[PDB]
Every structure is written in structure tokens, then in C-alpha cells.
Design an enzyme around this catalytic site. Structure first.
Site, PDB file in Angstrom:
ATOM      1  N   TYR A   1      -4.941  -5.549  -0.109  1.00 20.02           N
ATOM      2  CA  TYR A   1      -5.507  -5.194   1.202  1.00 20.02           C
ATOM      3  C   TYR A   1      -4.944  -6.055   2.308  1.00 20.02           C
ATOM      4  CZ  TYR A   1      -9.009  -2.058  -0.873  1.00 20.02           C
ATOM      5  OH  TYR A   1      -9.661  -1.004  -1.515  1.00 20.02           O
TER       6      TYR A   1
HETATM    7  N1  LIG Z   1      -0.259   9.689  -5.368  1.00 18.51           N
HETATM    8  C1  LIG Z   1      -0.819   9.814  -4.122  1.00 18.51           C
HETATM    9  N2  LIG Z   1      -0.148  10.389  -3.091  1.00 18.51           N
HETATM   10  C2  LIG Z   1      -0.699  10.497  -1.862  1.00 18.51           C
HETATM   11  N3  LIG Z   1      -1.954  10.073  -1.627  1.00 18.51           N
HETATM   12  C3  LIG Z   1      -2.677   9.496  -2.626  1.00 18.51           C
HETATM   13  C4  LIG Z   1      -2.109   9.357  -3.893  1.00 18.51           C
HETATM   14  N4  LIG Z   1      -3.024   8.759  -4.696  1.00 18.51           N
HETATM   15  C5  LIG Z   1      -4.124   8.524  -3.950  1.00 18.51           C
HETATM   16  N5  LIG Z   1      -3.914   8.959  -2.694  1.00 18.51           N
HETATM   17  C6  LIG Z   1      -4.923   8.890  -1.608  1.00 18.51           C
HETATM   18  O1  LIG Z   1      -5.082   7.560  -1.135  1.00 18.51           O
HETATM   19  C7  LIG Z   1      -6.456   7.157  -1.086  1.00 18.51           C
HETATM   20  C8  LIG Z   1      -6.657   5.861  -1.870  1.00 18.51           C
HETATM   21  O2  LIG Z   1      -8.027   5.477  -1.762  1.00 18.51           O
HETATM   22  P1  LIG Z   1      -8.885   5.313  -3.112  1.00 18.51           P
HETATM   23  O3  LIG Z   1      -7.965   5.486  -4.315  1.00 18.51           O
HETATM   24  O4  LIG Z   1     -10.047   6.202  -2.955  1.00 18.51           O
HETATM   25  O5  LIG Z   1      -9.289   3.778  -3.039  1.00 18.51           O
HETATM   26  P2  LIG Z   1     -10.344   3.090  -4.102  1.00 18.51           P
HETATM   27  O6  LIG Z   1      -9.592   2.122  -4.856  1.00 18.51           O
HETATM   28  O7  LIG Z   1     -11.098   4.198  -4.737  1.00 18.51           O
HETATM   29  O8  LIG Z   1     -11.350   2.248  -3.180  1.00 18.51           O
HETATM   30  P3  LIG Z   1     -12.670   2.776  -2.376  1.00 18.51           P
HETATM   31  O9  LIG Z   1     -13.884   2.162  -3.073  1.00 18.51           O
HETATM   32  O10 LIG Z   1     -12.618   4.256  -2.373  1.00 18.51           O
HETATM   33  O11 LIG Z   1     -12.395   2.171  -1.001  1.00 18.51           O
HETATM   34  C9  LIG Z   1      -7.266   8.230  -1.889  1.00 18.51           C
HETATM   35  C10 LIG Z   1      -6.283   9.371  -2.036  1.00 18.51           C
HETATM   36  O12 LIG Z   1      -6.719  10.511  -1.283  1.00 18.51           O
END
Ligand SMILES: Nc1ncnc2c1ncn2[C@@H]1O[C@H](COP(=O)(O)OP(=O)(O)OP(=O)(O)O)C[C@H]1O
Ligand SMILES: Nc1ncnc2c1ncn2[C@@H]1O[C@H](COP(=O)(O)OP(=O)(O)OP(=O)(O)O)C[C@H]1O
Ligand SMILES: [Mn+2]
Ligand SMILES: [Mn+2]
Lengths: 176, 175
Positions: A42
């Protein structure tokens, strides 16, 4: 599958991993990534300028899939965009030049599955436990309420009950 | 193109024919030839980056198809770039962080290699023809060694001090 500037997402504590996995087979989920280690760095300015805007900025590395991502969440709820990147340390150094530096790191094991339009993530965080996220990305703000309600229905289908929903982010759960 | 620093010397070119012979003699390798490069420069509303001697560029090069996000500065040596898939996706993400298009610089560019040196040959409308000799490094403790080596290369290449241009394209163009 990942297209949009909005991501509608619900996070649940997982009480029964077996039922979840059994339902992933019954519903013919397809594995996008399996048991990847995900390390999220982060980034924020000295004065937490991004957090003050309810923005998070993450450089993510996932192994052994080799996916690397620069993710900007926010400002505020349901806004999320990401870009594939070739080299985390390169983009990290570029962002450092602009004043954004490592604030903390979150590590987890995560599998990602697709079922139709939905993504389902099965996460484990040492010390915290097992979670699952159900999400859909869209460019259309006019259907966000509908999409979130569809996610809750879908989750129930895996044994993830209304009362196991977790509104806190991993950053919040880890005291960051 | 590996590094955090781009050691360069830039020149106006008076005779493209001599340059092209200068090139052939030395057995230069073409890397990309006659690309239209469009650079969108981004900054915060208060020109925060410029006030720090920093420039941030999204670069599109056609027909090579290359797309780069570049952060230059502080100062005229520090330079890092990342290949990017989708310029509009990165531009939107940077907009969320508060960086927005400030101006655009366009040019025709050809890039050649002679050993460790890059020779970039540029044309800008009105301003004319330019060539830059450059070496990239990750190690600031060798900037001296390299800028000397650039000077020796430019000398044997026939690019002369009287033709040197110390200004950036943004500086030449008044941006
Ligand atoms: N391979 C990918 N390509 C493009 N976008 C992606 C890919 N993988 C994940 N993302 C996007 O990026 C975002 C990442 O956030 P997320 O994975 O939800 O964080 P986290 O680790 O779950 O933490 P939170 O508790 O949600 O803040 C969610 C998703 O819509
Ligand atoms: N294909 C590439 N892959 C990675 N980096 C590249 C690539 N091509 C060029 N670069 C890097 O991007 C840098 C961009 O700076 P440069 O091309 O010198 O800007 P410019 O348009 O000549 O303007 P100045 O007058 O030099 O400020 C130079 C080089 O270190
Ligand atoms: Mn999440
Ligand atoms: Mn240059």
C-alpha cells in the site's frame, strides 16, 4: 472479466470452507488463479493525502500466476481501477518520485474463480482467518444497487449468509 | 533502456545526410524508425510536479505500437518508464490521483543503437531536427564516467559543441 471503473464487492467470513468448495464444483466455477500468494504494498504520501480522500493505492504481486497490478481504489465506495504492470519495483520507484511511499504491506493466499458474470475470491490471512469476496466490475453507475443485491443472492448460494458479511477492509482489520 | 538515469547530450542537426552517413559508418542498428510520438504531459492543478523539476508523460509511438508511462526528474537526468497496456486506463488512474493533461508534445522519432549508446533522431514542426546521444544507468555513482563517455562518443560521431541544445522540448516550446 475485469472491465470497469466501479467494482461492487461483498466480503464474508467463511465458516464452512468445505461447503464453499463443494458449491464451486456444483456451479462449475472456473479457476482464474489458484492458491496464489498475494503481496500488496500500500502506498501513500507523507501526510496520508490519499487516505484522507478515501483512496487506497496498491502494487500487487501474485505468485505463481505472475500477475502484477497497480490498483487505485476510491475515492470512496465502489470506485476501483487497475492496470497490469510488468515490474512492481519499477512502478514503485516511479510513484516514489511523485511522493508516494510504502505505508504497509498485506499478504494473503487467494484463489479467484469465475461463475458467469461474478467473481468469487477465497482468501486466507494468517491470524485473521478465511474470507470470500463476491464481486462484479462495471462502468455503469445506474445498476450498482441491483448488482450488489445480485452478489448477496449469489453468495448465499455458497453458504455465505447475510450475517457473515464483513464491512471492514483488510487494511482496517489489520489496524492500518 | 534499463535504469533510473538517462545520461544525454542533445544537438540541433544541420545536415541529416551527414548524420545518416555518420550513422552508417559507425554501423548503427535501427531500433524504431520514423515513429510519430505523441506525449501527453500531466500535472496537478497547481503545477506541483513542474515546481519540483518533475515531468510525467504518457507516450504513444506509432506505428511501433509502444505505449509508455514516463516519470522524469527531479532534474534533467533522472528518468524511469514502464510499458503500459492501455493509455486511457492509466490516464484515468492518474486523474484520480489529481494529475491531468497539461500540454502535448508531438515529434517524429527514430532510435538507433551503436554499442551501449542510443542515438535518437527527432523532427519537430517549426523547431527542426535534433539528435541526442544517450546511455542509461541504474547507478548514480557512475554518472560522471558516462557523461564523459557520451561526450567522447558525440565527438567521434561529429556532433559538435556549437550545436548543443541544453533545453528540453518542453523548455523549447514554452511549457
Ligand atoms: N487481474 C486483474 N485485472 C484487473 N483488475 C483486477 C484484477 N484482479 C483484481 N482486480 C481488481 O482490483 C481490485 C483489487 O481489490 P481487492 O482484491 O478487492 O483488494 P482486497 O485485498 O480484497 O482488499 P479489501 O479488503 O477489498 O480492501 C479488485 C478487482 O476488481
Ligand atoms: N521503448 C522504451 N522502453 C522503455 N523506456 C524507453 C523506451 N523508449 C524511450 N524510453 C525512455 O524514456 C525516456 C523519455 O525521455 P526522452 O525520450 O528523452 O524525452 P524527450 O521527448 O526527448 O524530451 P526531452 O527534451 O529529452 O526532455 C528516455 C528513455 O530513457
Ligand atoms: Mn476486496
Ligand atoms: Mn530526450
Amino acid at each position: 472479466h475485469f472491465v470497469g471503473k466501479y467494482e461492487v464487492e461483498l466480503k464474508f467470513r467463511v465458516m464452512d470452507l468445505t461447503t464453499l468448495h463443494e458449491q464451486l464444483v456444483a456451479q462449475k466455477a472456473t479457476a482464474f488463479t489458484l492458491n496464489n500468494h498475494e503481496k500488496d504494498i500500500y502506498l501513500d504520501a507523507n501526510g496520508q493525502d490519499l487516505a484522507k480522500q478515501q483512496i487506497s493505492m496498491v502494487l500487487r504481486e501474485m505468485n505463481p500466476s505472475g500477475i502484477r497490478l497497480w490498483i487505485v481504489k476510491g475515492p470512496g465506495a465502489e470506485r476501483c481501477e487497475a492496470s497490469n504492470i510488468e515490474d512492481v519495483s519499477k512502478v514503485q520507484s516511479m510513484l516514489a518520485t511523485l511522493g508516494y511511499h510504502p505505508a504497509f504491506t498485506i499478504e494473503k493466499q487467494r484463489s479467484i474463480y469465475f461463475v458467469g458474470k461474478f467473481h468469487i475470491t477465497v482468501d486466507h490471512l494468517t491470524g485473521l482467518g478465511d474470507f470470500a469476496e463476491i464481486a462484479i466490475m462495471t462502468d455503469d453507475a445506474t445498476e450498482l444497487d441491483k448488482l450488489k443485491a445480485e452478489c448477496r443472492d449469489f453468495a448465499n448460494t455458497f453458504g455465505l449468509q447475510v450475517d457473515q458479511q464483513e464491512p471492514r477492509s483488510y487494511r482496517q482489520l489489520l489496524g492500518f
